[PDB]
Design a binder for this molecule. Structure first.
Ligand SMILES: CCCCCCCC/C=C/CCCCCCCC(=O)O[C@@H](COC(=O)CCCCCCCCCCCCCCC)COP(=O)([O-])OCC[N+](C)(C)C
Ligand SMILES: CCCCCCCC/C=C/CCCCCCCC(=O)O[C@@H](COC(=O)CCCCCCCCCCCCCCC)COP(=O)([O-])OCC[N+](C)(C)C
Ligand SMILES: CCCCCCCC/C=C/CCCCCCCC(=O)O[C@@H](COC(=O)CCCCCCCCCCCCCCC)COP(=O)([O-])OCC[N+](C)(C)C
Ligand SMILES: CCCCCCCC/C=C/CCCCCCCC(=O)O[C@@H](COC(=O)CCCCCCCCCCCCCCC)COP(=O)([O-])OCC[N+](C)(C)C
Ligand SMILES: CCCCCCCC/C=C/CCCCCCCC(=O)O[C@@H](COC(=O)CCCCCCCCCCCCCCC)COP(=O)([O-])OCC[N+](C)(C)C
Ligand SMILES: CCCCCCCC/C=C\CCCCCCCC(=O)O[C@@H](COC(=O)CCCCCCCCCCCCCCC)COP(=O)([O-])OCC[N+](C)(C)C
Ligand SMILES: CCCCCCCC/C=C\CCCCCCCC(=O)O[C@@H](COC(=O)CCCCCCCCCCCCCCC)COP(=O)([O-])OCC[N+](C)(C)C
Ligand SMILES: CCCCCCCC/C=C\CCCCCCCC(=O)O[C@@H](COC(=O)CCCCCCCCCCCCCCC)COP(=O)([O-])OCC[N+](C)(C)C
Ligand SMILES: CCCCCCCC/C=C\CCCCCCCC(=O)O[C@@H](COC(=O)CCCCCCCCCCCCCCC)COP(=O)([O-])OCC[N+](C)(C)C
Ligand SMILES: CCCCCCCC/C=C\CCCCCCCC(=O)O[C@@H](COC(=O)CCCCCCCCCCCCCCC)COP(=O)([O-])OCC[N+](C)(C)C
Ligand SMILES: N#Cc1ccc(COC[C@H]2O[C@@H](n3c(NCc4ccc(Cl)c(Cl)c4)nc4c(N)ncnc43)[C@H](O)[C@@H]2O)cc1
Ligand SMILES: C[C@@H]1CC[C@@]2(OC1)O[C@H]1C[C@H]3[C@@H]4CC=C5C[C@@H](OCCC(CO)CO)CC[C@]5(C)[C@H]4CC[C@]3(C)[C@H]1[C@@H]2C
Ligand SMILES: CC(C)CCC[C@@H](C)[C@H]1CC[C@H]2[C@@H]3CC=C4C[C@@H](O)CC[C@]4(C)[C@H]3CC[C@]12C
Lengths: 1105, 82, 91, 92
């Protein structure tokens, strides 16, 4: 059948017939009038059945021969005289009119359906999600009216209570009862609002208009709101999203809905509210009017097991006005005050007139309701009852139903409502147990509800006690919440490619992920001996810093709102923000590169850049407070983050705004000096003190106190304890500023020689000038092999892959290799002794030198770039060569568009020759640079320098060249002037940032360099290899300075969050709106007090007469 | 529409054909010109507009291979029925 | 326009109707021009379609690309791209 | 102590709030033992507890050691004598 509905759900049709009561309507021909009018006691008359079996009985006179023994007339039994079949009416209502064409779903099932099959319909078949609340609205059965005051408020909270909790509203569906005003509340307060409420309406099929219109299989129904005055039935309301229409077999009568509805309430309250929680989906009953069937229903619920509470609304109709009335005059449980029988029966006799016996009967039904006063809520809309029915509907389930504070909290957790938990579960004087709070935390973390994690920490949860191994090991192994498919992939990589099927994640495996994601020499606390030991054992399992471990969890699970929350709790705030930037950045890179599912890398990089911006904004806060302590914050060993450093973590993530912040640049400037005080010295004296060593003793240095924020070597720090003479020489030659100039003077004296060598004749054997040059380039290359081995990271292929990621290290490799190719050819050649340059091998070697020299001038940009101003312009050149590339590809096309016709028109009689490759490209390029070749244009002219080139067609070339230069200069050169001038500012801004970033790697490279330059560096090597075989900088803090520094960081995260709010709360946009939202409330309170004075005037006339 | 008018029931041929033929409201002098173009240059004096003629305008205005529902066999057939 | 469905399609047809009416009204020398009025009417609907495509695109990029290319079946088996290209609607 | 909470006792300007209590009546006496030791003290209002909890937002505490445990009383001398000892100091 290709439909679960057709196979399972069943209709009902009165196959048998039973005529109406007795009476022929009028009109003597008794036989005719019988078949014409007479209803079946089914509910439909004889000609509506059609009931093919009964049809061959319709002809006789009907089914069932005549008088039929009046016992057997009433023997109508829906179980006996009515038949099932694969249903006809299930599809989609397409409400025509209204607006937007609101679209609902329906079905025509039998009341013989089992209760579970309806839950199988809503969820599996109609594709609905199981809710966290059900609101069963009973009330008016006949169309009524509400004060537009009382209308809109119930439409504020019945919505808001159903949006947040993903609730189902079970109505009657028919547009005559509560469903009208429930349905209207959907209208005014934007039921869509990007979050539709799954409003269901259960009605019986026998009483609804347009039954035929809803017939068909998966058919879109042209159903309309045509309230014909001649109609007798009800119209399906528009704004209800779903409908269940019981097929009682009869037509016309009500009744065959109340079973299914109550059984659906059971069938939902017998479902787990959420896989993590062990309650059932609660149910609440809401009331807007009522007759006897309603207040009887109210009694049922209070009697039920489990008891379903009730919310009555004073000011809405017959019952609800009464149920608040009788309830207000009542006491603790079960009473009327001594003289109230006369008054209350009169209200019954007036409010719903049955009269003095059915009043007293239903009055006794009202007694047993008021007995269970504890479950019923009487939210009265008059002034301020139960704080805005939202609270009342939701808090009503948190009343005398014996549910302990745990069960009270966990339900507000599933709903994701803290305002309830704050104001109604953490009420003054609550009876909390030992593990209830901790257990609710484990549920909030896994379900990713930060606002309860906040609430529980505030209300007494210590995350040191709640962070054991199995818990935090469980937290990674959860599908009960927002999970990361990226994590299980990262685990497969570190595990050599294997993944056993069950595989509960462990913490030693998370450690291998973080070590992989942070890279280099990072070593997590999960892979150490202390942890691996106690791990196999499981006070001693409590993680002294848990919020360092849940910040990683939140980030490996891609739970940002949890991450930013768990970040601002604890200490080491910048460090946690800079690790987090590196985790996501690596996850983004792996997620991008790894081809597993849809990318998710745009999400992770933004998460990285969010934490990377926090760290910068903190560093600015620290820096504006105390510049000296802020520089210490950059360089202290962390001891919880693998003995790393906040700079080292920012550099690790290529986080340029932190490295280009004016604190790092202020520190890097102070490491550049060393012990020297270059505030009260000058570069004249540093250079002179290099060439005149004894002048090292007459320039000023820094004390141990100015050097307290500056990281140092072990030896450098020991020599601050003592300033003697031999300490002032160590302090000088080991400064990065001194190593620099001491290398520039050697490098400038290098080029002066190597320029001299290349311009002067070169005999068979190298001159003294040339041996000094080979010594430099040789010893300089040993220096570079030393740089690679002592780089940072023990993984060799990374030492190499990072060293060739630098322009001037790649060119040195080319410049050094090329030079010894040149020296080999120069030196190892059979000299001729008649004329050099009869040896093509000596030529090659010399010409390699004459080109190798170019690498060594361009390298002066590495030394010029140490300056503030020069450096950025150096860095621009690369960024600008990259961006002009395509204007220059067009300029090269225009070149060959011209050079090939020019050469072909002027030189026809050419054989194939490699000169053709030159001549199509040579002169047209030199035209770009001012050379017009004025006397080679018009080769047939008298002033021509190419009169032999005159021939047929050569008059075309001046036209071609006129076009050529127009295109080059007047378009393509000025487009390029236009390019640069309109891209200068942002390339100059990036280039200041990139220069300030490379200034880290530059300066920190010079702590590592030896003292002596690259002719004399070999001494420093031989001394180092002699002291390596026979036998970086840290910020040393004493114990009282690590103390005062952590106090400094905490104080600056306070000022940060404070000033961030004070800026926001003091802004224009935020004061306009709080002004706006109070003129809301006041304007209501003036008309309220404007209404009261109207009720003060009435008293004046009252007390007057 | 909000108060219960279904535009599926209220959109018959004579109505929607009447709607084009109205001077009781803001009208377009451009339309009667567009109709003259598609009609080979002729315009009988009375000339209550029809829907096959609006179709030729839209096919002219949308250009290319656009073919409106007013020039198809299904519509031209039922049009002569009503 | 905002009642019914096929919202982009109706906005991109409308941009093409007015755009053609503007062109004919400009070229055709019948009365005062009224072409400045029709082109603004065209560019008004052409902007609605773009602003919807941005809305669709920010929701689901895969389904938004389907919206561009499904046959319409009420608009001569055309396509929302083909209608935007037809009106030289570059945004 | 709550007034410190709502109206932002830090606010970049902490009030030096002191609380003088006797040692004999405060819970978690053992947790506060040790020399210059950071104490893992918590707000665990055990229903089975009989003593009081030190409040959080007070910046300082002086806990008189009366030698006894359980009884109140050995605070009122020091407190009044501290008031004297401060009112006998030049305000500026
Ligand atoms: C005596 C006269 C003789 C010579 C005359 C002619 C001399 C001609 C002169 C040529 C100019 C010489 C300078 C080249 C500058 C390269 C720029 C650079 O660094 O880019 C990038 C290199 O990224 C890498 O990963 C590079 C790794 C391999 C080294 C580059 C090989 C180029 C060799 C050319 C050999 C030519 C020598 C020809 C001669 C045999 C920057 O790094 P990155 O992008 O960050 O990459 C790392 C990260 N990533 C991989 C994830 C991206
Ligand atoms: C960190 C990375 C960056 C640093 C990179 C460092 C590595 C740089 C790598 C450098 C090596 C490059 C190649 C060297 C030359 C060989 C090729 C050549 O042209 O040979 C010639 C010389 O043949 C000889 O026999 C004479 C060689 C004399 C020694 C000079 C090279 C050794 C120094 C190397 C010091 C390097 C180590 C530096 C310190 C580590 C052969 O030709 P010929 O015999 O002259 O003529 C033959 C024809 N005829 C006889 C008819 C005329
Ligand atoms: C017909 C002639 C045509 C061409 C002619 C010449 C032009 C040829 C040009 C080739 C350069 C190709 C590199 C493109 C730039 C890439 C980006 C960049 O910053 O690169 C590098 C810097 O920039 C440079 O290295 C630029 C070097 C050329 C600039 C001019 C040199 C002046 C000195 C010579 C004067 C000699 C004069 C006399 C000689 C006899 C470094 O960056 P990176 O480490 O690679 O990182 C990539 C950036 N990223 C991470 C943002 C992605
Ligand atoms: C779409 C944009 C429009 C472009 C604008 C219009 C384009 C300009 C149009 C210019 C008109 C053309 C001039 C040539 C006229 C014929 C020459 C001739 O008959 O004889 C000459 C041949 O000389 C040649 O054949 C050379 C051709 C002229 C090259 C002009 C290049 C354009 C430079 C300017 C471009 C900028 C123009 C600025 C505009 C104000 C010489 O005479 P002869 O008797 O053969 O020989 C005598 C012997 N003798 C040579 C030894 C002495
Ligand atoms: C702005 C104001 C400018 C003035 C306008 C007036 C125009 C007047 C037009 C004059 C053309 C006719 C005069 C020459 C008659 C033919 C004989 C002759 O002398 O031929 C000469 C070549 O020149 C030619 O053969 C003709 C050149 C035609 C093109 C001229 C430009 C067209 C207008 C512009 C459009 C440009 C397109 C622009 C695109 C952007 C040959 O003489 P030679 O070169 O000395 O070689 C002789 C030797 N040999 C036999 C060995 C080869
Ligand atoms: C600005 C620099 C800053 C610091 C730089 C770093 C420190 C580096 C400093 C200096 C380099 C060390 C070597 C110096 C050798 C030169 C002396 C000399 O003439 O030797 C040579 C001696 O011989 P001669 O008398 O010339 O006679 C010809 C010799 N011949 C037979 C071999 C042809
Ligand atoms: C690697 C780094 C080393 C450190 C640098 C310091 C140590 C290096 C210092 C010196 C080493 C050289 C020894 C000199 C030997 C004297 C003979 C001589 O050269 O006579 C020449 C005159 O010219 C000179 O005397 C000057 C030659 C050097 C010019 C460059 C020096 C500037 C750099 C250093 C100083 C400034 C430093 C600037 C920066 C602050 C005559 O020419 P010839 O070739 O002898 O004659 C044969 C000609 N033939 C081949 C055509 C037939
Ligand atoms: C990776 C580095 C290694 C590079 C490869 C190894 C290079 C070493 C290669 C060769 C070493 C051996 C040299 C002799 C070759 C055989 C020919 C011969 O002997 O004599 C002939 C030389 O003919 C030539 O071509 C000489 C020049 C060739 C050197 C090319 C170097 C470029 C390498 C790239 C640059 C490095 C850039 C590197 C940057 C990364 C003739 O000369 P003759 O003997 O005097 O006889 C006179 C002839 N006559 C009778 C006609 C008058
Ligand atoms: C032997 C006799 C003894 C004398 C010899 C010595 C002579 C003098 C030697 C060199 C000339 C410059 C001297 C002045 C230095 C001023 C100090 C200064 O501010 O330095 C700066 C520049 O530091 C440099 O190193 C700039 C480059 C100079 C060395 C290499 C030459 C490159 C240019 C060759 C071009 C070829 C042109 C061709 C022309 C022929 C660095 O310090 P800063 O700017 O304060 O740092 C700012 C950053 N901050 C704000 C973040 C902190
Ligand atoms: C279109 C703009 C206005 C111009 C209109 C008027 C011009 C119309 C167009 C072209 C005029 C062509 C005739 C002029 C030459 C006459 C003189 C002559 O003989 O010259 C030379 C030959 O010249 C030729 O043989 C011409 C080649 C054919 C023309 C090719 C198209 C060029 C223009 C592109 C197409 C046009 C569209 C371009 C769009 C801008 C000289 O050769 P020779 O005679 O053998 O000399 C003896 C040599 N000896 C002594 C060394 C042995
Ligand atoms: N203090 C200080 C200080 C001293 C020197 C420097 C120079 O920095 C050198 C490094 O600067 C790097 N670099 C450079 N180098 C600039 C440059 C290099 C070579 C030439 Cl021929 C030129 Cl025309 C310009 N440009 C970069 C870029 N656009 N993006 C990323 N990195 C770039 C490059 O790897 C090179 O090795 C920077 C700062
Ligand atoms: C898309 C771009 C279109 C233009 C262009 O790039 C691509 O197309 C290329 C094709 C090249 C030619 C191919 C083959 C040869 C044969 C050779 O014959 C040696 C003979 C003898 C020496 O005497 C041996 O001993 C001489 C050179 C020549 C003609 C090339 C010239 C350059 C040309 C035109 C190039 C030009 C820049
Ligand atoms: C085609 C061959 C055979 C002939 C020589 C090629 C030319 C173009 C070569 C020879 C020497 C080369 C230069 C050698 C050194 C440097 C310094 C480097 O930082 C940028 C490239 C630059 C500036 C090279 C550019 C290209 C260059 C000029």
């Amino acid at each position: 059948q290709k439909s679960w509905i057709e196979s399972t759900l069943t209709k009902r049709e009165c196959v048998y017939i039973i005529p109406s009561s007795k009476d022929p309507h009028r009109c003597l021909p008794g036989c005719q009038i019988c078949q014409q009018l007479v209803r079946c006691f089914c509910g439909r008359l004889v000609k509506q059945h059609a009931c093919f079996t009964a049809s061959l009985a319709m002809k006789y006179s009907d089914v069932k021969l005549g008088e039929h023994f009046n016992q057997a007339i009433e023997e109508w039994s829906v179980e006996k005289h009515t038949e099932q079949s694969p249903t006809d009416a299930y599809g989609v209502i397409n409400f025509q009119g209204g607006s937007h064409s609101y679209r609902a779903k329906y079905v025509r099932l039998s009341y013989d359906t089992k209760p579970e099959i309806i839950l199988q319909l809503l969820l599996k078949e109609w594709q609905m999600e199981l809710p966290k609340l059900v609101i069963s609205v009973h009330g008016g059965m006949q169309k009524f009216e509400l004060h537009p005051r009382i209308k809109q408020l119930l439409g504020k909270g019945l919505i808001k209570a159903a949006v947040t909790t993903g609730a189902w509203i079970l109505t009657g569906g028919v547009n005559t009862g509560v469903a009208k005003h429930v349905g209207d509340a959907l209208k005014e307060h934007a039921s869509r609002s990007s979050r539709k409420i799954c409003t269901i309406g259960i009605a019986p099929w026998g009483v609804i208009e347009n039954r035929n219109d809803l017939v068909g299989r998966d058919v879109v129904a042209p159903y309309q709101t045509l309230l014909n005055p001649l109609s007798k039935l009800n119209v399906l309301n528009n704004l209800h999203s779903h409908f269940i229409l019981v097929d009682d077999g009869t037509v016309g009568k009500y009744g065959a809905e109340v079973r299914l509805r109550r059984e659906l309430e059971k069938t939902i309250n017998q479902q787990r509210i959420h896989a993590r929680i062990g309650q059932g989906v609660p149910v609440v009953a809401l009331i807007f009017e009522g007759g006897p069937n309603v207040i009887l229903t109210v009694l049922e619920y209070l009697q039920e097991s489990p008891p379903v509470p009730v919310v009555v609304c004073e000011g809405t109709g017959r019952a609800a006005d009464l149920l608040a009335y009788i309830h207000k005059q009542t006491e603790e449980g079960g009473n009327l005050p001594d003289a109230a029988e006369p008054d209350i029966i009169s209200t019954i006799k007036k409010t719903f007139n049955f009269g003095q016996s059915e009043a007293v009967h239903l009055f006794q039904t009202m007694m047993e309701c008021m007995k269970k006063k504890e479950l019923i809520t009487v939210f009265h809309i008059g002034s301020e009852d139960h704080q805005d029915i939202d609270v009342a509907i939701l808090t009503a389930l948190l009343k005398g139903t014996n549910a302990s504070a745990f069960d009270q909290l966990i339900l507000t957790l599933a709903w994701d409502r803290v305002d309830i938990a704050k104001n109604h579960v953490f009420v003054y004087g609550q009876q909390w147990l030992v593990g209830s709070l901790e257990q609710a935390m484990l549920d909030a973390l896994v379900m990713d509800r930060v606002s309860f994690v906040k609430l529980l920490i505030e209300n007494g949860v210590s995350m040191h006690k709640f962070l054991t191994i199995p818990r935090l090991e469980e937290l990674y192994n959860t599908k009960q919440g927002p999970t990361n498919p990226m994590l299980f992939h990262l685990i497969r990589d570190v595990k050599q490619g294997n993944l056993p099927p069950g595989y509960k994640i462990t913490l030693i495996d998370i450690g291998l992920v973080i070590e992989y994601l942070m890279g280099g020499t990072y070593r997590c606390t999960y892979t150490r001996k202390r942890f691996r030991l106690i791990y196999n054992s499981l006070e001693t399992k409590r993680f002294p810093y848990p919020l360092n471990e849940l910040l990683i969890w939140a980030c490996l699970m891609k739970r940002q709102v949890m991450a930013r929350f768990l970040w601002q709790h604890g200490e080491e705030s910048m460090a946690k923000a800079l690790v987090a930037c590196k985790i996501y950045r690596s996850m983004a890179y792996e997620a991008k590169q790894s081809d597993l599912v849809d990318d998710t890398s745009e999400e992770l990089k933004q998460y990285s850049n969010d934490f990377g911006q926090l760290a910068v904004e903190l560093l600015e806060q620290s820096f504006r407070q105390d510049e000296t302590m802020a520089m210490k914050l950059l360089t202290y060993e962390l001891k919880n983050w693998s003995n790393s450093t906040c700079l080292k973590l920012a550099v690790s993530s290529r986080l340029r705004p932190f490295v280009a912040h004016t604190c790092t640049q202020m520190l890097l400037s102070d490491m550049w000096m060393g012990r020297l005080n270059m505030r009260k010295n000058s570069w004249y004296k540093v250079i002179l003190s290099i060439l005149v060593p004894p002048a090292i003793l007459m320039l000023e240095y820094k004390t141990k106190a100015e050097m307290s924020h500056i990281p140092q070597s072990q030896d450098a720090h020991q020599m601050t304890m003592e300033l003697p003479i031999t300490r002032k020489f160590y302090a000088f030659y080991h400064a990065p500023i001194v190593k620099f100039w001491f290398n520039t003077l050697a490098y400038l004296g290098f080029l002066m020689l190597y320029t001299f060598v290349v311009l002067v004749k070169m005999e068979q054997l190298p001159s003294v000038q040339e041996w000094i040059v080979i010594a430099y380039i040789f010893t300089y290359a040993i220096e570079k092999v030393r740089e690679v081995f002592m780089s940072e990271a023990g993984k060799i292929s990374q030492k190499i892959k990072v060293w060739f990621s630098d322009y001037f290290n790649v060119s040195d490799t080319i410049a050094i290799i090329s030079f010894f190719v040149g020296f080999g050819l120069r030196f190892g050649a059979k000299w001729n002794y008649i004329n050099a340059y009869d040896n093509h091998v000596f030529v090659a070697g010399r010409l390699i030198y004459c080109l190798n020299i170019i690498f060594w001038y361009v390298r002066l940009l590495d030394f010029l770039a140490v300056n503030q101003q020069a450096g950025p312009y150096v860095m621009m050149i690369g960024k600008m060569v990259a961006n002009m590339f395509y204007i220059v590809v067009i300029m090269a096309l225009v070149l060959l568009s011209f050079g090939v016709p020019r050469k072909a028109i002027l030189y026809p009689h050419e054989e194939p020759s490699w000169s053709l490759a030159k001549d199509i490209v040579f002169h047209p390029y030199w035209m770009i640079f001012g050379e017009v070749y004025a006397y080679e244009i018009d080769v047939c002219a008298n002033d021509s320098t190419l009169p032999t080139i005159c021939g047929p067609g050569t008059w075309l070339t001046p036209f071609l060249q006129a076009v050529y230069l127009f295109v080059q200069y007047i378009i393509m050169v000025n487009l390029l002037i236009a390019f640069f001038n309109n891209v200068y500012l942002q390339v100059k801004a990036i280039s200041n940032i990139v220069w300030k970033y490379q200034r880290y790697h530059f300066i920190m490279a010079y702590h590592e360099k030896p003292v002596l330059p690259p002719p004399l560096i070999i001494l420093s090597h031989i001394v180092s290899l002699f002291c390596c075989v026979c036998k970086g900088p840290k910020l040393f803090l004493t114990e009282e300075d690590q103390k005062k520094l952590h106090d400094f960081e905490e104080q600056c995260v306070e000022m940060y969050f404070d000033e961030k709010d004070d800026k926001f709360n003091s802004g224009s946009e935020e004061r306009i709106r709080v002004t706006f939202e109070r003129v809301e409330q006041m304007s209501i309170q003036i008309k309220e007090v404007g209404d009261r004075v109207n009720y003060i005037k009435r008293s004046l006339q009252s007390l007057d007469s």
